[PDB]
Amino acid sequence: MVDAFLGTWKLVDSKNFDDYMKSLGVGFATRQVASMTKPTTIIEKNGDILTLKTHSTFKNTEISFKLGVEFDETTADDRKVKSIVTLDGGKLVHLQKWDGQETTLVRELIDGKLILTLTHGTAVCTRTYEKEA
Ligand SMILES: Cc1cc(C(C)(C)C)c(O)c(C(C)(C)C)c1
């Protein structure tokens, strides 16, 4: 089910990340560093617990969760949100809610690449990752 997402992924393309960050109210100086950062995402499992790590020269984050069970999350931009990750049509869908707002982080595998689509408001960012050996 989740197994083809597991591993180490490196950012190879990004579209509209600044628009997504702006929509969330991230400050200009943080957007500016983040626009030049190429993070590594690591996805691991131990039983039914998934861990997702995002490593970079700027910010590092790590979450652990069970699919389909809500968890509290503090995001890289310091939002305190209620999160849930599920599997929907073969995609890993991460929904964050806070203050009546929502954002989705959808991960799909196409041609061996991991495509992350981030939506908040009208902003839609697409980030492409390639799997490390
Ligand atoms: C500012 C900022 C915001 C985010 C999200 C909003 C995607 C959570 C982020 O992922 C990053 C790194 C890519 C650097 C981890 C920086």
From Swiss-Prot:
Which parts of the sequence carry Phosphotyrosine? Answer: Y20
Which residues get modified to N-acetylvaline? V2
Q: What GO cellular component entries does it have?
A: cytosol; extracellular exosome; extracellular space; nucleus; sarcoplasm
UniProt cross-references to Gene3D superfamilies, sorted A to Z: 2.40.128.20
Query: Which residues of this UniProt protein bind hexadecanoate?
Result: R127, T128, Y129
Name the Gene Ontology molecular function terms of this record: cytoskeletal protein binding; icosatetraenoic acid binding; long-chain fatty acid binding; long-chain fatty acid transmembrane transporter activity; oleic acid binding
Q: State the similarity comment.
A: Belongs to the calycin superfamily. Fatty-acid binding protein (FABP) family.
Designated name of the protein? Fatty acid-binding protein, heart
Q: Which gene encodes it?
A: FABP3
